[PDB]
Amino acid sequence: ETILEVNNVPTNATSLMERLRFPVSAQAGKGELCAVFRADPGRSGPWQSTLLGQLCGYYTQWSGSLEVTFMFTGSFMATGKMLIAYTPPGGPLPKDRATAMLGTHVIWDFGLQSSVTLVIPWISNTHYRAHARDGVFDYYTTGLVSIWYQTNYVVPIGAPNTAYIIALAAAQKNFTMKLCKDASDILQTGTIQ
Amino acid sequence: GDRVADVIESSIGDSVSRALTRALPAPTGQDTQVSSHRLDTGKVPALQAAEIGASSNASDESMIETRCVLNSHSTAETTLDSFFSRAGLVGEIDLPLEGTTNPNGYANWDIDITGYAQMRRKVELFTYMRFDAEFTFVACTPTGQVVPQLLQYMFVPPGAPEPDSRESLAWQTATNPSVFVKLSDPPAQVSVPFMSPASAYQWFYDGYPTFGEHKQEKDLEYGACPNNMMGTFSVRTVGTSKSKYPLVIRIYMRMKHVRAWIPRPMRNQNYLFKANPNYAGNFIKPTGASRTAITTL
Amino acid sequence: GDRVADVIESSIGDSVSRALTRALPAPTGQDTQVSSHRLDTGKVPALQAAEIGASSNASDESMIETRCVLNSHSTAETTLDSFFSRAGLVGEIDLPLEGTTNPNGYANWDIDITGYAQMRRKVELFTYMRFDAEFTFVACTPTGQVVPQLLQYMFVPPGAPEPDSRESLAWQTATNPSVFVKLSDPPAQVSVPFMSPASAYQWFYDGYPTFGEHKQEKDLEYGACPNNMMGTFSVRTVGTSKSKYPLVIRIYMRMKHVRAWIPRPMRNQNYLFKANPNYAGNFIKPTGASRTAITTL
Amino acid sequence: EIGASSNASDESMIETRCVLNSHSTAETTLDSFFSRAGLVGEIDLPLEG
Amino acid sequence: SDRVAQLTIGNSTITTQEAANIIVGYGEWPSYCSDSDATAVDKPTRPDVSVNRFYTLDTKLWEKSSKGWYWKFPDVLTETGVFGQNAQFHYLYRSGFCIHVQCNASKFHQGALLVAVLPEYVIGSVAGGTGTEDTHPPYKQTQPGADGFELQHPYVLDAGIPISQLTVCPHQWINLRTNNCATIIVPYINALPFDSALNHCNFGLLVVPISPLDYDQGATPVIPITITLAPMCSEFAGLRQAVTQ
Amino acid sequence: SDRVAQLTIGNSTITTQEAANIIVGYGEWPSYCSDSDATAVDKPTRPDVSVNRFYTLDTKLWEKSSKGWYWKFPDVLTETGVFGQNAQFHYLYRSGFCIHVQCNASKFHQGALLVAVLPEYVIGSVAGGTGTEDTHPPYKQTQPGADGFELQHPYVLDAGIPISQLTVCPHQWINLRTNNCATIIVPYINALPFDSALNHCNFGLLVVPISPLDYDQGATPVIPITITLAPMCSEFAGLRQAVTQ
Numbered sequence A: 001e002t003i004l005e006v007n008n009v010p011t012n013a014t015s016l017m018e019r020l021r022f023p024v025s026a027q028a029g030k031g032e033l034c035a036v037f038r039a040d041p042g043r044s045g046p047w048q049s050t051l052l053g054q055l056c057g058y059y060t061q062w063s064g065s066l067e068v069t070f071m072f073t074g075s076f077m078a079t080g081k082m083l084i085a086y087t088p089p090g091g092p093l094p095k096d097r098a099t100a101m102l103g104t105h106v107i108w109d110f111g112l113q114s115s116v117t118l119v120i121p122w123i124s125n126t127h128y129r130a131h132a133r134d135g136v137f138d139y140y141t142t143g144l145v146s147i148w149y150q151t152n153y154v155v156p157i158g159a160p161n162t163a164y165i166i167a168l169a170a171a172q173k174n175f176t177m178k179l180c181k182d183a184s185d186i187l188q189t190g191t192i193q
Numbered sequence B, C: 001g002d003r004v005a006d007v008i009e010s011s012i013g014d015s016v017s018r019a020l021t022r023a024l025p026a027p028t029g030q031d032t033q034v035s036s037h038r039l040d041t042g043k044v045p046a047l048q049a050a051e052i053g054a055s056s057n058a059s060d061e062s063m064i065e066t067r068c069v070l071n072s073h074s075t076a077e078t079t080l081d082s083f084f085s086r087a088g089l090v091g092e093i094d095l096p097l098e099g100t101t102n103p104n105g106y107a108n109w110d111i112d113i114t115g116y117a118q119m120r121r122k123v124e125l126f127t128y129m130r131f132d133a134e135f136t137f138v139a140c141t142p143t144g145q146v147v148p149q150l151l152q153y154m155f156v157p158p159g160a161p162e163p164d165s166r167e168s169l170a171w172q173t174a175t176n177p178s179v180f181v182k183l184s185d186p187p188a189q190v191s192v193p194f195m196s197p198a199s200a201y202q203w204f205y206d207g208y209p210t211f212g213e214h215k216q217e218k219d220l221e222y223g224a225c226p227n228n229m230m231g232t233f234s235v236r237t238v239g240t241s242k243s244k245y246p247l248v249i250r251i252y253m254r255m256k257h258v259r260a261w262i263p264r265p266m267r268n269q270n271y272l273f274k275a276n277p278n279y280a281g282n283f284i285k286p287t288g289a290s291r292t293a294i295t296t297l
Numbered sequence D: 001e002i003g004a005s006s007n008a009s010d011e012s013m014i015e016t017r018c019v020l021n022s023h024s025t026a027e028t029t030l031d032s033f034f035s036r037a038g039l040v041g042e043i044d045l046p047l048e049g
Numbered sequence E, F: 001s002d003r004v005a006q007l008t009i010g011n012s013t014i015t016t017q018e019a020a021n022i023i024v025g026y027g028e029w030p031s032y033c034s035d036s037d038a039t040a041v042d043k044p045t046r047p048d049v050s051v052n053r054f055y056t057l058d059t060k061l062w063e064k065s066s067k068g069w070y071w072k073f074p075d076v077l078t079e080t081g082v083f084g085q086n087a088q089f090h091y092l093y094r095s096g097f098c099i100h101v102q103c104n105a106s107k108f109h110q111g112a113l114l115v116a117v118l119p120e121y122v123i124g125s126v127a128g129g130t131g132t133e134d135t136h137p138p139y140k141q142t143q144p145g146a147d148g149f150e151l152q153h154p155y156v157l158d159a160g161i162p163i164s165q166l167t168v169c170p171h172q173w174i175n176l177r178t179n180n181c182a183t184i185i186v187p188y189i190n191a192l193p194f195d196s197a198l199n200h201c202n203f204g205l206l207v208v209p210i211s212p213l214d215y216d217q218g219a220t221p222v223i224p225i226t227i228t229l230a231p232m233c234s235e236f237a238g239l240r241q242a243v244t245q
């Protein structure tokens, strides 16, 4: 497990560190949306911060199921429920929670166990997936993950109103890579000397 | 637990393929048996019915009076390896001193074997193929002479950074396979495995790679099979300065370890585009030759 | 043929109902065992959890010090037959000499037992019932005297022609069952089987009988169960001319061979309509009696 | 918090079929990853310089 | 343990950490129809994993003056996903259900909910106030859909039947001090082996707050209530074209 | 006998009295995917009787100057009944087919039809007549739907491939002198165990009149052609919300 950068919005040095977590807070109880990200490990995006993603950048073809673990770092007195959905390839981004439940999903309940595991099953037409990118090669897309509020983020008097969530990513025991190649990014601008 | 009769006796789940036909060895042609005259009613092998869709099965022994011939003609030369394991031209790369095509001394060639008619017609007799390959690189100047020049070939799998100049950093080839060879040497020859994410290459693909609205700009996606995109082949002249000789490179491919599925009709029109079965609409010609009348030769 | 593991090991088709509970004989009340004091930690039968939805199972022996009582009190009187096999009034038919209700000397009474509160409250404790019936017809004049008059009762199953007059041809009863009886005789008594197309009568039906738009006119269909429509009961005075005495008929029903399913809460409001659970909205009263304060009796 | 990767599998979360996985792991070994040549140094021998 | 649970069926999973066991309706698990009880002759369909999954329908707000709500089955699902498609295309229907109700608050909130399942829950009207009018409930009241409907007289449950005796039906309590979820498993309840999924409703689900919600000013005032449910052992028969209602 | 046949599957039945046997595509019956060939991990659905039934799509008129038509699979069914619903709701798809073509006339009519099945039938364009233009077939030509599409150059089949060699594909003839129907059974043809039912089309069905229709004035001039087909051993996987296209 390594930290996954779902919140890869900030870019300046004074704020690089909050790309490692994203917040939750009390809402109006209408099934609001929290975050979305794709499920390609070797593609540009959130997965580039993981060891699995960096290593898969060296191989063109992969196959296997992934796993994502979310850790809640609120106060002990805070409760809530969330819906975490995986949309299989071919479908657009869900517009609301009612549409998003129709995919693979898990209901997360805050308690003495801080973490939950969302397993991204291997659902594909081919035995292996080549590395797609922008353009017509996206026919090997993997799908989407979105996190929706289930009930609310309820907190008593005297505890903070905003809490942060840390996400960790890895691969399962059926994961495999193939066709070793050079990595896409070169960490040198001139002569290293 | 199954308790209802329609589930107990159900045939759902049968994963085995019922085969009506089986393969039989045939090293030589079939022999001819002795035959004699026949004068009887009710048994007629001459009359058939082509409507069913089956080839007529009347033989020599049932129609004319024949002798016994011990046929020993081999069938070894018509196998898939014997037909396909022959090298042929599939691509040319030009490296002129001055020009607009490859002015910098480097070139990228996307690997596809539908660029030349001789190979394309042979390979498109089938729909799916699974094979290994053998590539050969013959390099010479436009006048055909051999000169002391050092070249580098690099295989770039999809997803790797494509070189953009002769001094690009991608030429460090820490992971990509590469070949350093001189023009005075014999041609370079390497062996390439089967690289498809699927179980076979398909030369025809009736579909689009992505969802969405299929407008005019998003129309070239028809027939574009992502599983036949096998990367790029990059060439360059080794050196920090410009080369002295203009060079032409021809690539020859030889198949081996071949398996094929689903034969289809052969092409009878001139080719126009790559990965595109379009044909000249206003200039359609017959498959064969013509004659003045049907009653004369 | 099943060949895939997920079909071979599948649990689809299990038609047997897994029962967590079983029936045990209980002819008398349960005995009381001797108990003594207990002074220990970790074992507490007094504390429960009503959130689970289960009745608390602390007994006498676990809370107070008790003696041994050999309970021999029978439970025979609370059975379904003992509770329901008692006759009660379910319908009245009036046959006046002059009037607007039944002016012709004949009447049709649709058979339904939700017309009288005493029987309706008892029968509506449950949702489904399957039973046999016993009907009794007590006939007398409004002053209660018995007179020499001959009557005919006819049972008309649904689909049969309903009589329209005292001289209708339907009274030939070639197939319908009928009873000819005199008022001077004892009341008529007949036995009726279970007649539902389903396996039980349901007193509540959350649905409509037909498809279509559910507008204002097509709104009474709610709660109307066609399977409880058991036909009509027709009465008349035998004769070609008008009768001499005005008569009143009371029908009494007694259940037997009873089975019941799905108990539900008992009614606590006054009834208004037949086959209709409506209640007076502006006049809601509590289930029980009230008192001035919670700390006093 | 313990520092261990989560060990929930496919069979414990969703309803799955039986797949006979025969995908080799031979290509990710240390030799397969590292036994490829690459440039490490250049030496220049000019006539004047 | 007993307070922690995880329910997985199809491609969905529900976890909880404040459970209160599981109630099995009338001590019976859902099951298929046997050959001695079936009456129709055509072979029914059993789509299995595509319909037996958890569906989340909607969210309701719990306030200090809320009276209650009810949902009708399978009217809530007659228009959701593959189950809704099969229910529209087919004439017959047979299935059980697994209901999960979510409602969470803090340790400084209080209140109690009664979650019950009442078969053949016919809704009565107020009969025009005085009671001389023969009215019937309108469409939005008898068949509210997946959005539910609010009780007007929760003391009588809109049928003239006291709520104090609703616990004779399969039920669970949501007491914020102890638990934050409820689960009831309902087998198939009917007097017929198969019935229409569009005309007939088998049961109704009641959620009535017996103890009012109360908290101190400053705590979170938005306490939602969520309903999640999954059909079990579904069968369909009598295939024809689709009908809207 | 051989000229008489009856095909029954699901809740449908087709009878004929002028059959010409049954052609089995490549000598193989449709079958389910095995555990050693499957690659996805979730459990697929097998709806069985609700999708494996005969669907009648449309009727075409045969004239003296008709050129031919083609249909794409399973594009013809992507929007018909429970099969269409399942194909829209799911990501993956796998099935075979059973095609029956109806065309009848009198004993005084003549003509011949070639009914063939060509996998991966990519349709090419005329490339602007001269051939210097890079055109691609539009939507109504590549994916005509359940209404079919008419050939423009039947001698080349709109792909530059001669029709005289179309008999290497599974085929039957409709010769009005002998028969009035054709049946071809196609297993699953693909290089992948599962594929999309909306983006990818497996094969195309060709009906080209090789011998022109001819009759004497006074006989019936309206000779229709009908297509009937039934999916076989259907599987679906990757359930999500429905997508229109």
Ligand SMILES: CCCCCCCCCCCCC/C=C/[C@H](O)[C@H](N)CO
Residues within 6 Å of the ligand: B111, B112, B113, B114, B133, B135, B153, B154, B155, B177, B178, B179, B190, B192, B195, B201, B228, B229, B230, B233
């Ligand atoms: C240092 C080695 C340089 C030589 C690189 C040659 C590698 C060739 C890549 C594999 C070629 C696969 C054969 C053809 C596959 C696809 O079907 C074609 N692209 C068809 O378009």
Ligand SMILES: CCCCCCCCCCCCC/C=C/[C@H](O)[C@H](N)CO
Residues within 6 Å of the ligand: C111, C112, C113, C114, C133, C135, C153, C154, C155, C177, C178, C179, C190, C192, C195, C201, C228, C229, C230, C233
């Ligand atoms: C000559 C015989 C005349 C007597 C006719 C009495 C027959 C009675 C018919 C069967 C009664 C069934 C008992 C009640 C069934 C339904 O549930 C009720 N109608 C409820 O509305």
